C-alpha cells in the first residue's frame with residue numbers, strides 16, 4: 001500500500017555532494033572510473049574564493065565534489081558579501097566532516113516544488129535545520145535539514161545552469177565519456193538505531209515505508225511516486241560474523257551514507273567499461289559469486305534472461321534477484337576511498353512497465369540467501 | 381666549481397611523499413595521469429590502523445601517497461606499540477598540514493649511507509629536527525629534519541621492499557603502466573626569503589650552489605655528484621605582474637614545494653601519452669608557446685634537434701633551452717590539485733656524457749627571455 005503522504009511536493013533526486021579534501025583529484029578519478037562528464041564548475045576561475053566545486057554528469061545523475069580553499073582567501077567576506085556559490089558551505093564544517101568521516105556524501109539533494117515551503121514544513125514536523133532557505137539570483141532556492149549523522153537532505157527548487165555562480169565547462173576540458181549510467185536509483189544510510197531514524201525522517205517528510213540473519217535490519221522510505229528511495233540500515237549485534245553495518249559505523253565515526261545505487265540503461269556495457277578501468281584509475285568490484293550461483297540462476301530467472309544473457313551476467317559478476325513484480329540486476333564496487341565505508345551499486349531494473357515504476361524488483365534482499373547457499377554449494 | 385662539501389654521504393633521491401585527505405583517489409588519479417604502477421601498500425589490509433599509504437613507481441621514481449585513518453582505530457596504541465609503518469606519521473600533523481596547505485609534498489626523501497649519522501650531523505650543523513632516527517625491522521633507518529615551511533627532508537638508509545611493513549601489490553591490482561618517466565631530476569621550493577633559506581639548508585647539508593625581471597630570485601643547492609638538486613625561489617616585490625611566487629605563498633599558506641621535475645627517457649612518448657589522458661582523468665598542461673617560439677628555435681637548437689624533432693616539440697608544446705654544456709627539453713603541467721600551488725615538470729636532458737652528469741642543460745632560465753620575445757613576436 002502507498003498512502004501518498006508526502007507533506008510537500010517532491011520531484012526527483014537532483015544531485016549528490018561529496019565533501020573532499022581535494023575536489024580536483026576525486027572528481028577526475030570518479031569521471032574516468034564511472035564515465036561521467038565534467039559539466040560545471042565553481043572555483044577560483046569563476047570568482048569563488050571560498051570553495052572549489054566540480055560537477056560531473058551522466059544522464060540525469062549529478063555528482064558534485066567540493067573542497068575548501070584556505071580561509072585566508074575570503075577572510076574579508078561576510079555572509080552578505082560571500083563569493084561562495086553554495087551558501088550553506090562552511091570551512092569549519094567541511095574540514096570537520098572530512099577529518100571525522102573521510103571522503104563521503106555530505107548532501108543528498110532532491111528537487112522539490114518550493115524549497116522554502118519544504119524547509120518550513122519539514123522543520124514544523126521535527127526536522128533539525130541545517131541551512132535556512134536562501135534564494136540564489138532570484139532563480140533557485142536551496143535549503144538543508146539534517147538527515148542522519150552529518151549528512152543533510154538538501155531541497156532545491158527552480159522558478160524556471162546547475163546553480164547560479166556555476167559556469168559550464170569548456171568543451172575542450174569536457175570529454176564526452178559515457179558508460180551508460182543514467183540516474184540515481186536510491187541512497188542508503190547506516191545508522192546506530194533504525195527505529196528513531198525512521199521516525200525522524202518519515203516524521204518530517206511524510207515518506208512512507210516501501211517494504212520488501214545477515215547482520216542488519218532495514219526499511220526503505222519512499223516519496224509519493226516512489227522515485228525518491230531512501231533505505232536505512234541498523235546493525236544487529238550478537239552474531240558470529242560481526243555486523244558489516246557496525247564496522248561501517250566504527251570506521252566512519254558514526255552514521256552516514258553507505259551506498260549510492262546508480263541505474264544503468266545497459267548494465268552490461270557499464271560493467272564492461274568500468275571493469276576495463278579498475279586497475280588504471282577506476283573502481284574495483286566485489287569478488288564474483290561462485291559458478292554455482294549462476295547455475296542456480298537459470299532455475300530462478302530463466303524466463304526473464306536467456307541462457308546467453310545469464311552467461312553475460314556471469315562474465316561481469318552481475319547479481320540477479322526477482323520480486324513478484326520485476327527483476328533486478330545489481331553489482332557492488334569496493335569502497336570508493338581509503339575507509340571501508342561508502343561504495344557504489346550499479347543496477348538495472350526490468351519490468352513494472354506502465355515509464356517504469358520505482359523500486360521495480362526490490363533491492364536484492366533475496367540475494368543474501370542465494371549467496372549463502374552458493375557458498376555452501378560451491379564448497380561441495 | 382664544485383667544492384664537494386657534503387657533510388655526509390648522499391646517494392640519490394629516494395621518494396616523494398604527498399600528504400592527502402584520501403590517498404586512494406589521489407594515487408589512482410596520479411597513476412593513470414603519469415603512467416606509474418601501483419607497487420606497494422601499507423593500510424588496514426596490512427595491519428596498519430594509523431595511516432593508508434600507497435606507493436607508485438615509474439622506473440626509479442617513487443611517489444608515496446598517505447592519509448590518516450580515524451584516530452579511534454589506534455586509540456589504544458602508543459609509539460612503542462604502533463601499527464604505523466612510517467613512525468614519523470602523526471594524525472594531527474597530517475590533518476593540520478592538509479587543512480593549511482591542501483594537497484602537496486610533505487617529504488622530499490633522499491637515500492644516504494647512514495640516516496642516523498646524517499641526522500646527527502645535520503642537527504649539529506643547524507638543522508631543525510622533525511623526527512629522530514628510527515630503525516625499522518633492523519633493516520632500514522629513517523630520520524627527518526625541517527627543509528622549508530612544513531616540508532621535511534627525509535633521510536633513508538638501508539643495511540642491505542620499500543619499507544618494512546609495506547606489502548607488494550598483487551599483480552592483478554597492479555597494471556604495468558609506463559609512459560617513459562624514470563626518475564626525479566629536481567624538487568623546487570618556494571620560500572618568503574631566499575637568503576635565510578639557503579644559509580639554513582646549505583648550512584646543515586654542505587650542499588653547494590649549482591649556479592646558472594620575471595618576479596623571482598633563485599639558487600640551486602646540489603650534492604657532491606650534483607644528482608640531488610634542490611632549487612629554491614623567493615618572490616621579488618614591486619613589478620607589474622605580481623610575483624607568481626607570492627601568489628603561491630598566499631594560496632599555500634606559506635613556503636612549500638613548488639614543482640617536481642620528472643626525467644623521461646623519451647619526452648615525446650611521455651607527452652603523447654599524458655596529453656591523451658588530460659581530459660579523461662589525467663593532467664593538463666600549460667598553454668603552448670606561440671609558433672614564433674619554435675620558428676626561433678631552429679636558430680638556437682638547430683644543431684641538436686633536427687627540423688622534424690623540432691616539429692615534434694611544437695606538436696607537444698615542449699620547450700627547449702640550451703646551456704654551454706647541454707640541451708634541456710621541458711614542459712609544465714597545470715596545478716595538480718585545487719590550489720594554484722604544486723605542479724609537475726617533465727624534462728629530458730641531452731649532452732654532458734662521461735652516464736650523464738647532473739643538471740645537464742640547466743633548468744631553463746633562458747626560456748623566460750625567449751618566451752617574452754615570442755609573445756612580442758607573435759603579436760606582430
Ligand SMILES: COc1nc2c(C)cccc2cc1[C@@H](O)[C@@H]1[C@H](O)C=CC(C)(C)[C@H]1O
Nearest residue numbers: 188218220231232345363364365367368371
Ligand atoms: C550492501 O548492500 C547490499 N548488499 C548485497 C549483497 C552483499 C549481496 C546481495 C544483495 C545485496 C543488496 C544490498 C543493498 O543494495 C541493500 C541491502 O542488502 C538490503 C536493503 C537495502 C534496500 C538497504 C538494499 O539497497
Ligand SMILES: COc1nc2c(C)cccc2cc1[C@@H](O)[C@@H]1[C@H](O)C=CC(C)(C)[C@H]1O
Nearest residue numbers: 568598600611612725743744745747748751
Ligand atoms: C615554474 O618554473 C619554471 N617555469 C618556466 C617557465 C614558465 C618558462 C620557461 C622555463 C621555466 C623554467 C622553470 C623552472 O623549472 C625553474 C625556474 O624558472 C628557474 C630556476 C629553477 C632551477 C628553480 C627552475 O627549475
Ligand SMILES: [Co+2]
Nearest residue numbers: 188261345363
Ligand atoms: Co542497494
Ligand SMILES: [Co+2]
Nearest residue numbers: 568641725743
Ligand atoms: Co624546473
